[PDB]
Design a protein around this ligand. Structure first.
Ligand SMILES: CCCCCCCCCCCCCCCCCC(=O)OC[C@H](COP(=O)([O-])OCC(O)COP(=O)([O-])OC[C@@H](COC(=O)CCCCCCCCCCCCCCCCC)OC(=O)CCCCCCCCCCCCCCCCC)OC(=O)CCCCCCCCCCCCCCCCC
Ligand SMILES: CCCCCCCCCCCCCCCCCC(=O)OC[C@H](COP(=O)([O-])OCC(O)COP(=O)([O-])OC[C@@H](COC(=O)CCCCCCCCCCCCCCCCC)OC(=O)CCCCCCCCCCCCCCCCC)OC(=O)CCCCCCCCCCCCCCCCC
Ligand SMILES: CCCCCCCCCCCCCCCCCC(=O)OC[C@H](COP(=O)([O-])OCC(O)COP(=O)([O-])OC[C@@H](COC(=O)CCCCCCCCCCCCCCCCC)OC(=O)CCCCCCCCCCCCCCCCC)OC(=O)CCCCCCCCCCCCCCCCC
Ligand SMILES: CCCCCCCCCCCCCCCCCC(=O)OC[C@H](COP(=O)([O-])OCC[N+](C)(C)C)OC(=O)CCCCCCCCCCCCCCCCC
Ligand SMILES: CCCCCCCCCCCCCCCCCC(=O)OC[C@H](COP(=O)(O)OCCN)OC(=O)CCCCCCCCCCCCCCCCC
Ligand SMILES: CCCCCCCCCCCCCCCCCC(=O)OC[C@H](COP(=O)(O)OCCN)OC(=O)CCCCCCCCCCCCCCCCC
Ligand SMILES: CCCCCCCCCCCCCCCCCC(=O)OC[C@H](COP(=O)(O)OCCN)OC(=O)CCCCCCCCCCCCCCCCC
Ligand SMILES: CCCCCCCCCCCC(=O)OC[C@H](COP(=O)(O)OCC[N+](C)(C)C)OC(=O)CCCCCCCCCCC
Ligand SMILES: CCCCCCCCCCCC(=O)OC[C@H](COP(=O)(O)OCC[N+](C)(C)C)OC(=O)CCCCCCCCCCC
Ligand SMILES: Nc1nc2c(ncn2[C@H]2C[C@H](O)[C@@H](COP(=O)(O)OP(=O)(O)OP(=O)(O)O)O2)c(=O)[nH]1
Ligand SMILES: [Mg+2]
Ligand SMILES: [Zn+2]
Lengths: 320, 459, 39, 99, 347, 98
């Protein structure tokens, strides 16, 4: 029975399947801040589902057979090419950021659907509320035009206003010099070209914009690089949080029903990520888009609605 | 008429249920079989028409227009195979669907015994025609062409709707056979003046009449090859067929109401022929040729003599094959050079020897070389208009001079002279291109031997 | 010659407050995308 | 650029990959069956058989009968003292003129 | 809004309309109008934003003013006849107020300024109710009082509705405003034939409801409220653009489509009554409506407008929208002309 | 009709003109709307009482109930307007021009 108005009436209220340990937690930080391990540890310690940081192919991992799709069905935006030529006139700089925000927005809807449908909390990595740090860093380094920032705000202010914020925000504070030291040791040929000014801007966005605004509606936990290695200590603080500020205290079954009806309809979530704002970075000509759409429909198990593809062994099509 | 309606509908399932690589083959083949069966409509009697049922009938006026219509559909599919080559399959099968739906409305339009059934299908042809122009035109002006082609027709069609219904409430029936026995004379009052215009201006716009023709240079020029062929070969004759029918119930008022429309036609005939002398676009030049030729049909229909009606019918069929052929010839050049400018590719007779022969044969019929049916139809209208007024010979003689000037000028600016040096992609003529022209001219030339079948009900 | 399809210049003609701009209709910002005005 | 658009493709000559191309299609097998139906149903059926069919139409529009009927009347009305043709299509005995 | 309360509110809107239809007493007719308005304002406020608040306020004031005029007509009728039966009014002044109150409720020009604005400020689902179901009750009263309506007044409202409806929609890029002005234009046809043959008022109403429901359903399926947003549908759901083309062409009155049926039948009735000028003016004036429908066809189906990069992310999800009865409505909106003599079921 | 009908019927006209000419306040206009129903109540009550139409005597009470129930809805909209702009001025309800 697909969730809807009828299921809610029959008894599928959110509060009936949510406890005091059903929280949404985001682990944020600079590049090579160790958030991956810390988030993956808080997840297993508290029995919370872990969502790997949404990338360029996150949406492709939640549909079809789960494997990444060719790059052309992602806007041709590549994280690797961003580091090589951040000033490329094609528009890969912003075209990546606009796509990544959509993936983060899509994941945040996947997260809330899991929390509101099963009662189990989730741990995220750089949720939509903290993806503007890469926006400011790109702009302050002359990687994207001013209008691109305006386009980002228009899309953000009509999408981020529908969802509730995370219960707890864990910020893994790391000084910039250490971060760049870790980049060299990691061994990524392209990521090593990240300049120090770019990484410093990301920290300023966190310290200047994200944290002060987030502290008024979330329980913010700050840990240095060394403190982040004691996963048991971090989990202890999360279990001692007061949870007295934020919009989550005003939510009831009626409101959580309306929220769930949104995050389960993934096209309604992505509706305003393609606003008719004509920006050369994200605008695509009709001839190109038409060609790519036809190719996308020829990939295995994508010509028809998921479950009606005879070419991937779906049966009983003449009765479904 | 169900024996031709049902096969035409079954072409749509054929296109959609055919193999992805056999859409053109199957549709072309079975459309030719429908055209072959249309020859049974020639069972015509000297006193009564062939009346099938309460809805449909076919007389000597509808029969030639039906055979040209069903014969034109196969030729439109051949002409479209080039520019619909990188088009995706679903849209290719939608394009063929529009062409089939247009034929279905046309044959029913030419056989509707009821004048309101005639009106509905008459207007129904606008929808597929507009879709073909605007969805499969190459230029930005196709969008503006559809608006002109749409609102010019509806500006005159809607008054016709009111007039037809008013007639039914007065006579009691719009069945054509009944009107032949219940028709009453029209008095000379201001109310009947506007009843006359409402019943006629819907067809003047489609002929088109000079002054109300600005849509044709925009629609025939921006439309794809298939759209232009049907637009100039059949859809212009929808206006002519309408007048030949509805002028039955407008006597004796047509004696004086026709004067303003004979001067627009007789003079506009000279003007549009003159325009073709200075056109810089080969497709546009052919479009203005249709206006000049259809000016004769308006005159012949409005003077109402046995010789004028015989000439008008032969002229409508004669122009249908010629105008369609000229558009096809002009498109073969476009498919190579991809430019409609007439002065861009010259001396083509040196690179395409056979295609130049088609150009000559097309031009000769356009200028009414005897004994082609182009001349037979034009000659009969000239004989009838001479008796109408001996002075008209001056206007219809001057038009002959101008018609020969712009037809051979078209044949000299493209086929003769010096070949363009910087154009090196003029490949030889495909079998598809050559066969497309042979199908236009052979029936056109063959009708000379037995022309009584295109002389209409008054033969 | 490929078929012409609308470009950004053509499209922006349909993305204003009104189709026919005049002196009065100037300064009319298009409505918000989600119909919510700032509080 | 104002957008990300594909470059304009160039028309492909069907004579490059198939010098025997009839121009109907890129597939050399389909291209040869498209030609045959056009030529067999077009020139061998509609024209040759249609032209013959129209040639032997059974007395189209009752014209040959009318000539044979007039000769009969001429024989009758000429060698009987009657006028060859009358100026009245209908006998006056059935008409009733005004006043 | 709790789902159960939403159902109860919706049923109250229908109960309000149904009471107007089944009632033989003016007070019960007035009660139905009050109940219907009481239960439609809440669904206009469901999104709780300033524009929705403004739209509801404008809607409340217009209907409230109309309701008072309607009750003033009933009392004047009572003074001059001493009865409440829902039939021809017995005083010409009552007839004018009743006719004008029903014009304000229907949004007929010049009582139309609220329809473009109220429709804009409320969601598509709310706008669908406002433009389709809300006209059943006012049209019911006109169908019963038409003998006593002033002929010049009703035709003047009908003519001005067609003109202002056609002119208003030309300068619109918001779909909800385009439908709002298309509603006003089609209203003129309904009330223009009402003096001559009330049955054709019902035929036009049913056809208008089916076609307007289809357009709103297809706009709701993609959450599109502007011309440019609707211009991406070719790159998301290509089938939907073809349906829009057929329905818009039908709404324009083009043969052989269903939308031609009411225009075709209204001309017949008026011409039988020696009314030749008005149908010709109405038919010609309706070309304005056909124009801004054809302008949506270009930007939606007949041309491929520019897309955006994120549109590719929408190809990986299906349409979960309910789209209730959309397959049936589109067919009824485009292929019902061969069944025109079925309009006699409405007699 | 009678001298009383001249004034009661004229009271409705005055309140009707008052409802169709807003000055600044949305509250001042709802009062004019309530003025119309008061004049209708008195005009309907007089006609019913004078003619001894017994069963119609309940009609003015139904009118009062529904009209008052409509005012309660009108006041709820005025309050929500005030919560947005801090005042009940109608000139602030002009966002739907565009
Ligand atoms: C059935 C026909 C089947 C077609 C078979 C063609 C074929 O396979 O031979 C290849 C044949 C010779 O091959 P070729 O050597 O490579 O020449 C082709 C080149 O393009 C070079 O072509 P061209 O420049 O030498 O022109 C040849 C063409 C045109 O040449 C001309 O002379 C120009 C036309 C001027 C004629 C004016 C004379 C007045 C006519 C009225 C008198 C009667 O000749 C004709 O049309 C016939 C002679 C006139 C009779 O090709 C052609 O001649 C042209 C294609 C065929 C066109 C046929 C048109 C006539 C068909 C009429 C049939 C119906 C009867 C009509 C009776 C009523 C009369 C109006
Ligand atoms: C003859 C002509 C026949 C043509 C009739 C045209 C029918 C086409 C219906 C439009 C398509 C429905 C749709 O897509 O949903 C849109 C919309 C949902 O859009 P949404 O913004 O996403 O959700 C709204 C809330 O968030 C709600 O969100 P929620 O989570 O709180 O859920 C609440 C609950 C609510 O579920 C319900 O809708 C049930 C409410 C009871 C419906 C009435 C039952 C009547 C039978 C008993 C008597 O679930 C739904 O909302 C389901 C979506 C609606 C689907 C059901 C629509 C039934 C339409 C067929 C019945 C037509 C009767 C008149 C409609 C009422 C007029 C005010 O639902 C509507 O309100 C549609 C109302 C339809 C009004 C126009 C009806 C045509 C007027 C002519 C009637 C025939 C005379 C001519
Ligand atoms: C009097 C006889 C009237 C016949 C009524 C029976 C059909 C209605 C029951 C099926 C239904 O749920 O549709 C009602 C209604 C329409 O839903 P829908 O989404 O438009 O149905 C299409 C889906 O694909 C539906 O597909 P699905 O996979 O979601 O559900 C399968 C459905 C499949 O049921 C269907 O066949 C759907 C299509 C039925 C026809 C719907 C239109 C109603 C008939 C209008 C006919 C108008 C003719 C006008 C002719 C004028 C010219 C003479 O089978 C049933 O539910 C059987 C229930 C039997 C009761 O659904 C409801 O919300 C109410 C329940
Ligand atoms: C020059 C060389 C001429 C040699 C032949 C001379 C002898 C001769 O052929 O005469 C025999 C006849 C005419 O001679 P006849 O009619 O006087 O007598 C011959 C037959 N008997 C004796 C029995 C009466 O020729 C024809 O009838 C040919 C008719 C041509 C038909 C053309 C139409 C075919 C295509 C139809 C579908 C496409 C049409 C599209 C246009 C639609 C318009 C309707
Ligand atoms: C029988 C005798 C036949 C006589 C025929 C007479 C000619 C009929 C009218 C032909 C109309 C020509 C096509 C319409 C003009 C056009 O193509 O549009 C030009 C102009 C551009 O506007 P737009 O396209 O919206 O914006 C730019 C988008 N790129 O468009 C505009 O700016 C405004 C468009 C106005 C809408 C067109 C109206 C069509 C004509 C009917 C109008 C109503 C008639 C009067 C109604 C009653 C009196 C008011
Ligand atoms: C460019 C500007 C174009 C301006 C066109 C103006 C047309 C409007 C005026 C025409 C009005 C004609 C009319 O209404 O005729 C009334 C007449 C009444 O019939 P009846 O009752 O029998 O009269 C007997 C009286 N003893 O009815 C009749 O007898 C005949 C009615 C026939 C229907 C007339 C249709 C309208 C005429 C349109 C003219 C063509 C215009 C084409 C361009 C579109 C405009
Ligand atoms: C760019 C626009 C293109 C579309 C234009 C559409 C056509 C224009 C409208 C034409 C309207 C019909 C003309 C008649 C109008 C009504 C008056 C009338 O009908 O009078 C009839 C009159 C009867 O009296 P009487 O002449 O004595 O009878 C014996 C005649 N054999 O008999 C007569 O008087 C004879 C007819 C009189 C008409 C004289 C026309 C002279 C001008 C002819 C050129 C037309 C120019 C059009 C201008 C467009 C700009
Ligand atoms: C007879 C003439 C034709 C009538 C047209 C047919 C009816 C309209 C279409 C169905 C509407 C519908 O069901 O409403 C929408 C939803 C449908 O459930 P869902 O979760 O969206 O889908 C679930 C099914 N699936 C996913 C399998 C497809 O139902 C409800 O909310 C049910 C509400 C029931 C309680 C109502 C409250 C009490 C009312 C009484 C108060 C006094
Ligand atoms: C000999 C012979 O019957 O030929 C007639 C031809 C066969 O072609 P062909 O003449 O053998 O080859 C000539 C072509 N070339 C040069 C490419 C080989 O029939 C057809 O195509 C008939 C059309 C197919 C369907 C027929 C159903 C009726
Ligand atoms: N332009 C852009 N790049 C991003 C964004 N989030 C991550 N990236 C890039 C930065 C890195 O090159 C890469 C992964 O960076 P991480 O933050 O995840 O750190 P790292 O993987 O090196 O180790 P860690 O998980 O922190 O322990 O992806 C983003 O929101 N915008
Ligand atoms: Mg990482
Ligand atoms: Zn080409």
């Amino acid at each position: 029975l697909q969730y809807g108005p009828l299921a809610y009436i029959l008894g599928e209220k959110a509060t009936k399947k949510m406890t005091e340990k059903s929280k949404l937690i985001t682990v944020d930080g600079n590049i090579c801040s160790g958030k991956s391990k810390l988030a993956k540890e808080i997840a297993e310690k508290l029995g919370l589902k872990h969502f790997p940081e949404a990338g360029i192919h996150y949406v492709d991992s939640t549909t079809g057979d789960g494997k990444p799709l060719p790059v052309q069905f992602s806007g041709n935006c590549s994280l690797e090419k961003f580091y090589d030529d951040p000033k490329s006139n094609d528009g890969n700089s912003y075209r990546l950021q606009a796509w990544l925000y959509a993936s983060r927005l899509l994941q945040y809807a996947d997260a809330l659907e899991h929390l509101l449908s099963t009662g189990q909390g989730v741990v995220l990595e750089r949720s939509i509320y903290s993806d503007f740090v890469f926006l400011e860093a790109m702009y302050r380094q002359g990687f994207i035009r001013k209008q691109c920032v305006d386009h980002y705000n228009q899309v953000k202010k009509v999408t981020i206003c529908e969802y509730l914020p995370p219960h707890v925000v864990v910020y893994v504070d790391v000084p910039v010099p250490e971060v760049q030291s870790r980049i060299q040791k990691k061994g990524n040929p392209h990521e090593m070209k990240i300049t120090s000014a770019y990484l410093q801007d990301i920290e300023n966005a966190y310290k200047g914009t994200f944290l002060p605004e987030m502290s008024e509606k979330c329980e913010v936990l700050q840990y240095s690089a060394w403190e982040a290695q004691d996963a048991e200590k971090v989990v202890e603080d999360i279990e001692y949080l007061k949870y007295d500020k934020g919009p989550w205290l005003d939510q009831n079954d009626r409101k959580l029903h309306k929220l769930r009806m949104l995050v389960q309809d993934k096209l309604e979530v992505l509706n305003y990520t393609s606003i008719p704002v004509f920006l050369p970075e994200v605008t695509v000509g009709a001839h190109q888009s038409d060609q790519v759409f036809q190719e996308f429909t020829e990939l295995p198990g994508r010509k028809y609605r998921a479950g009606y593809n005879e070419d991937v062994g779906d049966k009983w099509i003449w009765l479904k | 008429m169900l024996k031709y309606i049902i096969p035409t509908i079954m072409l749509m399932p054929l296109t959609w249920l055919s193999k992805n690589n056999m859409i053109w083959v199957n549709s072309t083949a079975h459309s030719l079989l429908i055209s072959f069966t249309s020859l049974l409509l020639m069972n015509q009697f000297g006193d009564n028409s062939l009346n099938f049922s309460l809805l449909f009938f076919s007389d000597s006026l509808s029969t030639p227009l039906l055979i040209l219509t069903m014969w034109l559909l196969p030729l439109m599919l051949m002409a479209s195979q080039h520019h619909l080559s990188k088009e995706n399959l679903t849209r290719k099968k939608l394009f063929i669907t529009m062409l089939i739906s247009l034929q279905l409305f046309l044959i029913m339009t030419f056989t509707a015994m009821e004048l309101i059934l005639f009106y509905i299908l008459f207007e129904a042809t606008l929808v597929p025609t507009l879709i073909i122009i605007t969805r499969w035109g190459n230029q930005t002006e196709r969008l503006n062409a559809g608006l002109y082609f749409l609102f010019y027709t509806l500006a005159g069609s809607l008054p016709l709707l009111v007039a037809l219904i008013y007639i039914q409430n007065t006579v009691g029936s719009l069945n054509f056979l009944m009107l032949q026995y219940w028709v009453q004379p029209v008095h000379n009052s201001w109310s009947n003046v506007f009843m006359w215009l409402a019943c006629m201006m819907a067809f003047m716009v489609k002929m088109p009449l000079y002054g109300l023709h600005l849509w044709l240079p925009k629609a025939h020029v921006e439309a794809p090859i298939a759209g232009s062929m049907v637009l100039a070969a059949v859809l212009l004759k929808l206006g002519g067929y309408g007048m030949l029918r509805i002028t039955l119930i407008l006597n004796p008022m047509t004696d004086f109401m026709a004067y303003p429309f004979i001067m627009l036609s007789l003079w506009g005939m000279i003007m549009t022929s003159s325009i073709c002398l200075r056109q810089t676009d080969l497709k546009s030049l052919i479009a203005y040729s249709s206006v000049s030729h259809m000016a004769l049909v308006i005159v012949a229909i409005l003077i109402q003599t046995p010789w004028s009606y015989m000439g008008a019918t032969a002229l409508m069929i004669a122009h249908g094959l010629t105008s369609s052929m000229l558009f096809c010839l002009a498109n073969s050049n476009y498919e190579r050079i991809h430019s409609r400018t007439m002065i861009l590719a010259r001396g083509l007779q040196t690179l395409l020897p056979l295609m130049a022969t088609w150009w000559l044969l097309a031009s000769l019929t356009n200028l009414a070389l005897p004994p082609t049916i182009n001349l037979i139809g034009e000659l009969f209208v000239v004989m009838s208009t001479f008796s109408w007024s001996n002075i008209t010979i001056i206007l219809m003689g001057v038009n002959m001079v101008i018609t020969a000037l712009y037809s051979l000028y078209m044949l000299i600016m493209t086929q003769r002279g010096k070949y363009t040096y910087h154009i090196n992609n003029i490949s030889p003529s495909f079998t598809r291109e050559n066969a497309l022209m042979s199908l236009h001219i052979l029936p056109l030339l063959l009708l000379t031997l037995n022309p009584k079948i295109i002389l209409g009900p008054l033969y | 010659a490929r078929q012409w399809q609308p470009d950004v210049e053509w499209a922006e003609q349909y993305g204003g407050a009104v189709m026919y701009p005049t002196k009065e209709t100037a300064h009319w910002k298009p409505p918000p995308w989600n119909d919510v005005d700032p509080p | 650029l104002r957008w990300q658009e594909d470059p304009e493709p160039e028309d492909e000559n069907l004579y490059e990959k198939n010098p025997d191309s009839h121009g109907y299609d890129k597939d050399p097998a389909v291209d040869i069956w498209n030609m045959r139906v056009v030529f067999f149903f077009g020139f061998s059926i509609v024209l040759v058989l249609g032209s013959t069919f129209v040639a032997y139409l059974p007395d189209y529009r009752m014209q040959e009968w009318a000539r044979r009927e007039a000769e009969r009347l001429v024989k009758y009305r000429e060698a009987h003292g009657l006028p060859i043709m009358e100026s009245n299509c209908f006998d006056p005995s059935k008409i009733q003129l005004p006043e | 809004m709790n789902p159960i309360i939403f159902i109860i509110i919706l049923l109250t809107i229908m109960l309000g309309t149904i009471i107007v239809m089944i009632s033989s007493h003016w007070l019960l007719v007035w009660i139905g109008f009050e109940m219907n308005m009481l239960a439609i304002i809440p669904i206009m406020m469901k999104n709780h934003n300033p524009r929705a608040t403004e739209a509801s306020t404008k809607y409340f004031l217009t209907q409230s003013t109309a309701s008072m005029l309607l009750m003033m007509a009933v009392i004047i009728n009572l003074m001059f006849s001493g009865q409440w039966t829902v039939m021809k009014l017995f005083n010409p002044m009552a007839s004018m107020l009743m006719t004008m109150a029903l014009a304000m409720k229907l949004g007929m020009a010049p009582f139309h300024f609220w329809v473009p604005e109220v429709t804009q400020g409320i969601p598509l689902s709310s706008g669908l109710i406002l433009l389709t179901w809300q006209k059943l009750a006012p049209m019911s009263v006109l169908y019963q009082i038409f003998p006593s309506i002033n002929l010049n007044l009703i035709l003047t409202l009908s003519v001005l509705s067609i003109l202002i409806g056609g002119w208003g929609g030309l300068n619109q890029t918001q779909l909800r405003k385009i439908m709002a002005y298309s509603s006003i234009a089609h209203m003129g046809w309904m009330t223009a034939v009402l003096p001559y043959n009330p049955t054709m008022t019902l035929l036009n109403l049913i056809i208008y409801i089916i076609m307007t429901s289809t357009m709103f359903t297809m706009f709701m399926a993609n959450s599109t409220t502007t011309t440019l947003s609707l211009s991406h549908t070719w790159n998301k759901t290509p089938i939907m653009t073809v349906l829009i083309l057929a329905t818009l062409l039908s709404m324009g009155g083009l043969p052989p489509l269903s939308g031609f049926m009411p225009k075709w039948m209204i001309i017949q009735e008026m011409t039988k009554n020696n009314s030749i000028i008005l149908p010709t003016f109405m038919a010609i004036t309706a070309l304005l409506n056909l124009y801004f429908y054809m302008r949506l066809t270009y930007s939606t189906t007949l041309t491929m407008f520019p897309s955006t990069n994120n549109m590719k992310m929408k190809w990986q999800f299906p349409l979960m929208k309910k789209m209730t009865f959309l397959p049936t409505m589109v067919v009824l909106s485009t292929m019902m002309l061969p069944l025109t003599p079925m309009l006699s079921v409405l007699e | 009709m009678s001298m009383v009908y001249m004034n009661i019927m004229m009271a409705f006209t005055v309140s009707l003109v008052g409802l169709l000419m807003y000055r600044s306040h949305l509250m001042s206009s709802l009062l004019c709307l309530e003025g119309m129903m008061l004049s209708l109540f008195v005009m309907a009550a007089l006609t019913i009482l004078n003619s001894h139409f017994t069963l119609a005597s309940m009609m003015p009470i139904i009118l009062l109930v529904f009209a008052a129930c409509e005012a309660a809805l009108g006041l709820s909209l005025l309050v929500m307007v005030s919560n947005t702009y801090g005042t009940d001025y109608v000139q602030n309800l002009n966002l739907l021009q565009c």
